[PDB]
Amino acid sequence: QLNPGARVKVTITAPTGYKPIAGQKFVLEIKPKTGASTIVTRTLSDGYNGGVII
């Protein structure tokens, strides 16, 4: 659990077919129970040996 005004490091592993590669956009919809649902779309620059997604 998260008390309000706190954070946690979430770690996602994409399923076998869905692992995105450089230049491929992915979307992640975060759906807390009882709350507004976010979405964060990114596209890996074609580049990106890894690390921060700008």
């Binding site: 979307v27 919809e29 759906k31 649902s37 979405i39």
Partner: protein, 55 residues
């Protein structure tokens, strides 16, 4: 003129009163119990709403 016969009627006035009283209560409870149902359904009508969540 004797109140003996007045008694005979006084029964009848009382009896139809009690029967009306009897039914009006029954009519009344149902009125109430109906009035309750529409209310319960009334709140259930609004609060039973369902929603599309996110994209």
């Amino acid at each position: 003129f004797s109140g003996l016969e007045a008694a005979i009627v006084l029964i009848a006035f009382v009896v139809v009163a009690a029967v009306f009283s009897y039914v009006m209560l029954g009519a009344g409870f149902f009125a109430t119990q109906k009035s309750q149902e529409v209310t319960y359904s009334g709140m259930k009508q609004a609060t039973s709403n369902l929603i599309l969540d996110g994209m």
